Amino acid sequence: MLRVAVPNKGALSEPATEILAEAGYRRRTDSKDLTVIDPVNNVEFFFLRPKDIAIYVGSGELDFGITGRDLVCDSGAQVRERLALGFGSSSFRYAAPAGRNWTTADLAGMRIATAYPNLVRKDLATKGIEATVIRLDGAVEISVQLGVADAIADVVGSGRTLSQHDLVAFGEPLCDSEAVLIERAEARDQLVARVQGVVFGQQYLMLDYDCPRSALKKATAITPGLESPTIAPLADPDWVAIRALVPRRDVNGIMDELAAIGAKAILASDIRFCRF
Amino acid sequence: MLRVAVPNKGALSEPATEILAEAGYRRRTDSKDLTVIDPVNNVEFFFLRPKDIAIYVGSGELDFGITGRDLVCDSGAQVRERLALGFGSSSFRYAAPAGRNWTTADLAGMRIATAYPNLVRKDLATKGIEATVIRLDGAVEISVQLGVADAIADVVGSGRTLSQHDLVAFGEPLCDSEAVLIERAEARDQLVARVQGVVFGQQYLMLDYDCPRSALKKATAITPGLESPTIAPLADPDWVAIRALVPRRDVNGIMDELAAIGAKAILASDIRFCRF
Ligand SMILES: Nc1ncnc2c1ncn2[C@@H]1O[C@H](COP(=O)(O)O)[C@@H](O)[C@H]1O
Ligand SMILES: Nc1ncnc2c1ncn2[C@@H]1O[C@H](COP(=O)(O)O)[C@@H](O)[C@H]1O
* Helix or strand holding residue B257 (H, E): helix B251-260
Q: Can you tell me the distance from the alpha carbon of B121 to that of B276, in angstroms, rounded to the nearest whole number?
A: 41
Q: Is B146's CB within 8 Å of A51's CB? A: no
The DSSP line for chain A is: -EEEEEESSSTTHHHHHHHHHHTTPPPP-STT-SEEEETTTTEEEEEE-GGGHHHHHHHSS-SEEEEEHHHHHHHT--EEEEEE-S---EEEEEEEETTS---GGGGTT-EEEES-HHHHHHHHHHHT---EEEE-SS-TTHHHHTTS-SEEEEEESSSHHHHHTTEEEEEEEEEEE-EEEEEE--HHHHHHHHHHHHHHHTTEEEEEEEEEGGGHHHHHHH---SSS-EEEE-SSTTEEEEEEEEEGGGHHHHHHHHHHTT-EEEEEE--S----
Query: Which helix (DSSP H) or strand (DSSP E) does residue B10 occupy?
Result: none
Mutate to test the interface with A, among B61, B63, B111, B142 (most CBs of A within 10 A): B142
Q: Which CATH architecture has domain B1-84+179-203?
A: 3-Layer(aba) Sandwich (3.40)
Q: How many angstroms separate the CA atoms of A102 and A150, rounded?
A: 11
B93 CA from centroid of ligand 2 (Å): 12
- Is B258 touching A (CB cutoff 8 A)? no
Contact B143, A60 (CB under 8 A): yes
Which of A142, A144, A145 has the highest number of chain B CBs within 10 A, making it the mutation to test binding with B? A142
Q: Report d(CA A176, CA A11) in Å as an integer.
A: 16
Q: Does A60 touch chain B (CB under 8 A)?
A: yes
Closest residue in B to A56 (Cα) is B148
Q: CATH assignment of A91-176, given 3.40.50.1970, 3.40.30.10, 3.40.50.300, 3.40.190.10?
A: 3.40.190.10
Whole-number CA gyration radius for chain A: 24
Per-residue buried b or exposed e for A183-206, using 16+ beta carbons within 10 Å of the residue's own CB = bbeeeeeebeebbbbbbbbbebbb
Helix crossing, B187-201 with B13-22: angle to 10°? 100
DSSP state of B214: G
Q: Ligand 1 pocket, A156 CB below 6 A?
A: yes
What is the least distance, in Å, from the CA of A142 to any CA of chain B?
9
- Matching fold, domains B1-84+179-203 and B91-176: yes
Q: Please, what is the end-to-end C-alpha distance for chain A in angstroms?
A: 27
Using an 8 Å CB-CB cutoff, list chain A residues near B134: 55, 59
- Nominal resolution (angstroms): 1.8
Phi-psi region of A61 (alpha: psi -120 to 50; beta: other; left: phi over 0): alpha
CATH of B204-270, picked from 3.30.70.120, 3.40.190.10, 1.20.1290.10, 3.40.50.11540, is 3.30.70.120
* Distance of alpha carbon A22 from alpha carbon A85, whole angstroms: 12
Nearest to B151 by CA among B96, B195, B204, B201: B96
Domain ranges of chain A: 1-84+179-203, 91-176, 204-270
Q: Which of A73, A77, A26 shows the shortest CA–CA distance to A177?
A: A73
Q: Residue A236 corresponds to which amino acid?
A: D
B59 CB-near residues (< 8 Å, 6+ apart): A111, A134, A147, A148, B77
What is the three-class DSSP state of B28? coil
CA distance B49 to B101: 37
Nearest CA in chain A to B116: A137
CB of B164 sitting under 6 A from ligand 2: no
Question: B221 CA to chain A: closest CA distance, Å?
Answer: 53
Contact: A34, B148; criterion CB under 8 Å: no
Separation CA A10–CA B73 (nearest Å): 28
Q: Is A90's C-beta closer than 6 angstroms to any atom of ligand 1?
A: yes
Name where chain A breaks: residue before each gap, C-N > 2.5 Å.
185
Give the HSE-up count for residue A2: Cα atoms under 13 Å, Cβ half-sphere.
22
d(CA B260, CA A121): 71
Q: What pairs with residue A135 in β-bridges?
A: A114
Burial of residue A233, with CB atoms counted within 10 A of its CB: 0-12 exposed, 13-18 middle, 19 or more buried: exposed
Chain B within 8 Å of A196 (Cβ-Cβ)? no
Q: CB pairs under 8 A, 24+ apart, for A119-122?
A: A119/A70, A119/A73, A119/A74, A119/A92, A119/A153, A119/A174, A119/A175, A120/A153, A120/A174, A122/A73
Q: How far apart are CA B47 and CA B56, in angstroms?
A: 11
Cα–Cα distances in Å, from A130 out to A50, A86, A110, A119, A121? Answer: 29, 35, 8, 14, 9
Contact B137 A52 (CB under 8 A): yes
How far apart (Å, rounded) are the C-alpha atoms in residues B68 and B38? 24
In this structure, the dihedral spanned by the alpha carbons of residues A182, A188, A193 and A196, taken in order and rounded to 10 degrees, is -10
B5 vs B17: CA distance, rounded Å: 11
